[PDB]
């Protein structure tokens, strides 16, 4: 399959495997993505989801151009495609566990949307980023405009989206589009896999609350915070600390 999930204990990998089209997404791939997220989410052992190319190189060159051109006059395709992409983006961005995009090449348009929907991005030296709808007279979904502005602010967001120009790994790192430069996700994934999954999931929801406009703690967030002290992970943390050993979450 051109999009598939590999589950390896604490780590899952969402793999894009269509090297002869530079990992371009077709409609079926967009529709397939939520199913794979559901499969991953149902695994209690999971601690982190990595999104990456199956074969290095380009992360995702965006829309399948042959599909776009073949269907350019097909209103049913455009409406189905719009909905499928929006579902995928919504679900990926709200995946229950930490998510990491490992970008090793071109990450363009809809590909950039996928990367933006992950919690953090690592860029290898060949990584390139761009959002190119303005070159075809199209628009970017508001959901994804927000993901972009969240990271880089409105000045850089408009620079990228108005021009459709590519930027390199170092510039993406400089402007906050990617959090880390590196050749491999292994070190980060190692760190993410060993902390409390109660903590990461709860903190992830708090960050999303802030992004959705929550300004102060309220009764519910106070309760969630408090519930940590009644949890098995806290008991493992304190027990491990007393025994001077690493906690096993």
């Amino acid at each position: 399959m051109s999009l598939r999930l590999e589950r390896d204990g604490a780590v899952a990998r969402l793999l894009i495997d269509r090297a002869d089209r530079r990992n371009a997404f077709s409609l079926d791939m967009w529709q397939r993505l939520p199913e794979l997220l559901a499969e991953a989410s149902g695994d209690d052992a999971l601690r982190v989801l990595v999104v990456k190319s199956a074969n290095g190189g380009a992360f995702c060159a965006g829309a399948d151009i042959a599909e776009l051109l073949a269907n350019k006059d097909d209103a049913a395709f455009h409406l189905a495609n719009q909905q499928a992409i929006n579902r995928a983006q919504y679900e990926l961005a709200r995946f229950r566990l930490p998510t990491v995009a490992m970008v090793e090449g071109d990450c363009i348009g809809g590909g950039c949307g996928i990367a933006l929907a992950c919690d953090m991005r690592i860029a290898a030296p060949a990584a390139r980023f761009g959002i190119t709808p303005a070159k075809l007279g199209l628009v970017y979904p508001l959901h994804d405009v927000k993901l972009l502005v969240d990271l880089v602010g409105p000045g850089q967001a408009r620079r990228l989206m108005f021009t459709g120009g590519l930027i390199d790994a170092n510039e993406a790192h400089r402007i906050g589009l990617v959090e880390l430069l590196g050749e491999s996700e292994d070190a980060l994934v190692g760190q993410l896999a060993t902390v409390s999954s109660f903590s990461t999931q709860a903190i992830k929801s708090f960050v999303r609350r802030v992004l959705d406009g929550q300004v102060a703690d309220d009764t519910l967030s106070l309760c969630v915070f408090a519930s940590a002290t009644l949890g098995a992970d806290f008991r493992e943390g304190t027990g491990a600390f007393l025994e001077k050993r690493p906690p096993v979450f």
């Binding site: 309760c223 969630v224 408090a226």
Partner: protein
């Protein structure tokens, strides 16, 4: 600390649920069971305005229970209720039995 909580008035459910949140936050390791009967049963509907609060109580490991007699008198279907809701034959029977088992009663 075992507490059996009663909620019977639909118009007071919002405040009752906040009171349960208060109880949980104040009593460490509280073991709470909330029994909704009479008109309050409507708060357990999928389209309920307090659904998110009820779901949060469930997240906090609070047992949410609905009265079957009340479900029937309000002409509601189990298919209509929030998933994960437990049901007892009688809300009042549950409240009385839990108390006989040592649970502390709190009427909201």
């Amino acid at each position: 600390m075992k507490v059996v909580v009663q909620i019977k008035d639909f118009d007071k459910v919002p405040q009752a649920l906040q009171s349960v949140l208060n109880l949980f936050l104040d009593l460490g390791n509280a073991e709470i069971e909330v029994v909704l009967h009479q008109s309050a049963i409507k708060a357990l509907l999928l389209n309920s305005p307090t659904r998110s609060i009820i779901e949060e109580l469930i997240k906090l490991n609070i047992l949410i229970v609905g009265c079957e007699h009340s479900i029937r008198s309000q002409n509601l279907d189990h298919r209509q209720l929030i998933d994960g809701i437990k049901i007892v034959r009688s809300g009042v029977g549950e409240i009385v039995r839990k108390q006989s088992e040592g649970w502390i009663y709190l009427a909201l």
